[PDB]
Design a protein around this ligand. Structure first.
Ligand SMILES: *[C@@H]1O[C@H](CO)[C@@H](O[C@@H]2O[C@H](CO)[C@@H](O)[C@H](O)[C@H]2NC(C)=O)[C@H](O)[C@H]1NC(C)=O
Lengths: 223, 218, 194
């Protein structure tokens, strides 16, 4: 078996330096080669850097050439990447990969990349707003109800509902970032009109950087 | 970077044959034969499928084959099993010792019958406007093809870039999909406008569906 | 008894050209026909013998030499050839020399930035005698008035590394070579075909 693990990637502010490590076991790490590859969320893959078996030679993409540095310690089966002057375009997922007997030029083995993003915004917590049930929604005796979060920076979030005991018809869409640079998300549940007049629906949001929860109730507006 | 061109998406019925193409410079895929193909299911590290001269790694089904023709190379997949929908990327080595990746092709398998979207629209007006910002939200629920197109209409005028949409992953109970849509506006502009509407055109629908409301009704 | 050709061809790492390893093969049953008809061998030239006949033959003992060399140099590994590798690294005899087998192992032997584990003799006092091997790695200065006194590095160095890169292309790719020698009459046979 062969396995690789990346570590150290995380939140940082722009213009700073950061160091990533990748550790391999199960093969002669010194013999082949190590590569770094990154994937900006929602985009394809692109190549970042490469180092040779001896570490004597290095190559980098024009976007990172001279800015980043790649180094390895073949005595520890350990690989390292040094990043300097990080910019908003470096906010991707970075994978380490190595050659194999199939070809030193081939990204045969891959780790499970760390997520790194540069942001000047602080760990602002989310705010929760409700959706307005109405005729343009409630139709055919069926209606959708939802809660909306106002932009927040930290990556971890979890939405809870009365329906959390049985999430049938409940969705928690992938969060998205506003031009402000902070994440936001929407969650909705589908319910019958009989429930709108007989059951309370309240949403509560969990945010690990701030254990103080936020919650809001949805009620059928006359609009 | 001479990033290789690829089709944005391809689709086929289960058991059919389908081919993905990759194209590059005479020194990026022409000449050398090191073209390789990678597979990446969502949420996990990419796998490889093909490499030099269409060879295939051990432990991978013989259903995948590769071909090269000068400036272009292609990957053909047969016996679609719906597990191959993972996006495929081509890769090649280039002179001046540089690697290039293709834009990635997303494969959609018609693993079930078409299912129509359910659509809802909601104003977050009361709390959001009290906070000092305005947005409008439109919801598309449990559709199948997921190729849906979404448009925002204000006073029947079309808006773009001012909205952000998010699509949830395939619901394994029925392979359906859902999309969230939301346009953002400033308090002054939100008060200037009178009518708000969202429009969707999709294979899941027999004809475009539009939902609209006037801010002045309530 | 089966023959170790499997480990001979698939040894995972062949010796450098200048220091070519050898291995004695004995008491084998040599399934030459099943080896020869394989598609991986880019060349299977034979001298004084033909490959299809090889199973109908039966030599006393056979040696196999192995080294990794570049495509243009593979042409030099033939009886009667001359050139830097044939002259300095591995002089094939000007006589029978059995089959020369080569395949393009660029995948294993070439590496990004060039493989420096494989070296060749840039020059020598005089060309090697058939099957001669030497490990003597001393700078060729000879001291004297023409060059820097002995032990000095002015007069280059005897060895150089190929630096096999994928970019090197089909012309400069590294091939893996093995060559077998067959001798007769000096002893009773000990290995034969199936
Ligand atoms: C070196 O390894 C290869 C791969 O295992 C051997 O080729 C295989 O041989 C077996 C037995 O004849 C066949 O069943 C396989 O189909 C072969 N595989 C391939 C990919 O060709 C090869 O025989 C080994 N070297 C020698 C000298 O035998």
């Amino acid at each position: 078996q062969v396995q690789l693990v990346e570590s150290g990637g995380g939140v940082v502010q722009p213009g700073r330096s950061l160091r990533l490590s990748c550790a391999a076991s199960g093969f002669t790490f010194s013999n082949y080669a190590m590569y770094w590859v990154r994937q900006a969320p929602g985009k394809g893959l692109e190549w970042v850097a490469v180092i040779s078996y001896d570490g004597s030679n290095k190559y980098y993409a024009d976007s990172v050439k001279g800015r980043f540095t790649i180094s390895r310690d073949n005595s520890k089966n350990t690989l390292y990447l040094q990043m300097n002057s990080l910019r908003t375009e470096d906010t991707a997922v970075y994978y380490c990969a190595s050659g194999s007997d199939y070809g030193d030029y081939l990204l045969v083995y891959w780790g499970q990349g760390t997520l790194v993003t540069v942001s000047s915004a602080s760990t602002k917590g989310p705010s929760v707003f409700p959706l307005a049930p109405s005729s343009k929604s409630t139709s055919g005796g069926t209606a959708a109800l939802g809660c909306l979060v106002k932009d927040y920076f930290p990556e971890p979030v979890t939405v809870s509902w009365n329906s959390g005991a049985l999430t049938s018809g409940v969705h928690t869409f992938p969060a998205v970032l506003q031009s402000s640079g902070l994440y936001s998300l929407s969650s909705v549940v589908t319910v019958p009109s009989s429930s709108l007049g007989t059951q309370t629906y309240i949403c509560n949001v969990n945010h690990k950087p701030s254990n103080t929860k936020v919650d809001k109730k949805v009620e059928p507006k006359s609009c | 970077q001479s990033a290789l061109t690829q089709p944005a998406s391809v689709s086929g019925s289960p058991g059919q044959s389908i081919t993905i193409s990759c194209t590059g410079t005479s020194s990026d895929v022409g000449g050398y034969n090191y073209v390789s193909w990678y597979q990446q299911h969502p949420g996990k590290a990419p796998k490889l499928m093909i490499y030099d001269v269409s060879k295939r790694p051990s432990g991978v089904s013989n259903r995948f084959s590769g071909s090269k023709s000068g400036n272009t190379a292609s990957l053909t997949i047969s016996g679609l099993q719906s597990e191959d929908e993972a996006d495929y990327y081509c890769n090649s080595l280039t002179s001046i010792s540089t690697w290039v990746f293709g834009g990635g092709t997303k494969l959609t398998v018609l693993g079930r019958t078409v299912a129509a979207p359910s659509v809802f629209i909601f104003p977050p007006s009361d709390e959001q406007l009290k906070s000092g910002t305005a947005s409008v939200v439109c919801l598309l629920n449990n559709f199948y093809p997921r190729e849906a197109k979404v448009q925002w209409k204000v006073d029947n005028a079309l808006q773009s870039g001012n909205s952000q949409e998010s699509v949830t992953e395939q619901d394994s109970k029925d392979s359906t999909y859902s999309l969230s849509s939301t346009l953002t506006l400033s308090k002054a502009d939100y008060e200037k406008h009178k009518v708000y509407a969202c429009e969707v055109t999709h294979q899941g629908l027999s004809s475009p569906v539009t939902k609209s409301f006037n801010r002045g009704e309530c | 008894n089966l023959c170790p050709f499997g480990e001979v061809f698939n040894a995972t790492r062949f010796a450098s050209v200048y220091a070519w390893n050898r291995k004695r093969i004995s008491n084998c049953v040599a399934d030459y026909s099943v080896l020869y008809n394989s598609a991986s061998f880019s060349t299977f030239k034979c001298y004084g013998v033909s490959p299809t006949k090889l199973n109908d033959l039966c030599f006393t003992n056979v040696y196999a030499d192995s080294f990794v060399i570049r495509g243009d140099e593979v042409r030099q590994i033939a009886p009667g050839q001359t050139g830097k590798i044939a002259d300095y690294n591995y002089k094939l005899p000007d006589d029978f020399t059995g089959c020369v087998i080569a395949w393009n192992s660029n995948n294993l032997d070439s590496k990004v930035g060039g493989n420096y584990n494989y070296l060749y003799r840039l020059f020598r006092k005089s060309n090697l005698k058939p099957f001669e091997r030497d490990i003597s790695t001393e700078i060729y200065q000879a001291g004297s008035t023409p060059c820097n006194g002995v032990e000095g590095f002015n007069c280059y160095f005897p060895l150089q590394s190929y630096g096999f890169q994928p970019t090197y292309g089909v012309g400069y790719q590294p091939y893996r070579v093995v060559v077998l020698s067959f001798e007769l009459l000096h002893a009773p046979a000990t290995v034969c075909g199936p």
